[PDB]
Amino acid sequence: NFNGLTGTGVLTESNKKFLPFQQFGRDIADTTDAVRDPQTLEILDITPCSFGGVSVITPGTNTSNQVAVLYQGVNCTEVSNVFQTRAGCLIGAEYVNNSYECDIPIGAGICASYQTQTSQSIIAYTMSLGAENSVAYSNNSIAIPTNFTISVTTEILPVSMTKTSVDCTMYICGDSTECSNLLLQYGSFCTQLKRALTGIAVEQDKNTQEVFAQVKQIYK
Amino acid sequence: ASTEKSNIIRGWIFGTTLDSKTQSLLIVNNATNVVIKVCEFQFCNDPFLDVYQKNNKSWMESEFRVYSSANNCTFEYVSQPFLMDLEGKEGNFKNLREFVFKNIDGYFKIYSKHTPINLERDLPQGFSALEPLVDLPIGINITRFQTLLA
């Protein structure tokens, strides 16, 4: 509470040239950064109290119960192995120098997995983009295949959703005529919502038709 | 604002009635004294005042010819440094200064700034902001004012 200004923040020494009459100090989002000490005339900057987001990495209850907590943004010095990845302080995993495929995406390249190191422990590592393959590039060399392998792959693509339609006057107002009267004042919104839902339903029907009904003769 | 020389407008006067009805504001800037008085009185219809440039350290230049009455004053300022910029002595470098007065909720506000001029026959084209110096907490309705020349 520096002469009235009431905020919570980490106050650290700065380098701002304050002009000798300026007192508070603000930013570009109308916050309240730098504050000048009522007494000693120094200019110290306020920086938001280290807050972030907790992320619990779980390899699945079926496998085991050991979990790891990721404190996004925090610097480990603001709160078992503790590694500082550029995506947060990961507490509950050890950084292995090896590289495997990304099982659980941590952030900023780091990926976690439940492995039996040498014994099951959540580990952390840098995801490998694949195996390095050095193909020869002689001026007079070519690779021509001698055999082939027919592979039938699969692809899943949605077509339509569940056509929904809500009873606006029944959902918003129960069986209460008093309530029905005050929605008539709220305007023509129920009409727009019903029109949007009917359009969505017709659109899903048209999508199904244009995806499956593409031929005229039904072959047997 | 003021550019040609200086030591002429060594003061100002504010007030809405000027008939002993509201408090005034004298900002006379005399020798090493800038005492501002917020008393309520009717001085005269033509506040004339000479220079009397006495270089003595113990002398009063602001005579009693400006006002002729007094009452129960409400506020006064006894700041030692004079509310006036510094004068320069050079061939063509003159002293340019401006005062931005104002009057809002209660406070008056007297922003101010001094600037050197580089040419003697060119217009003062340039940007110069003004920072607050003093804030008088006396609130009074004011609709007119009067300059105090020498």
Binding site: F21, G25 | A1, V100, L123, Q125, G126, F127, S128, P132
Partner: peptide, 16 residues
Amino acid sequence: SYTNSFTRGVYYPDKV
């Protein structure tokens, strides 16, 4: 007389 206010007259409004 009467003359121009080129661009003079701008002040630091609040003390921030």
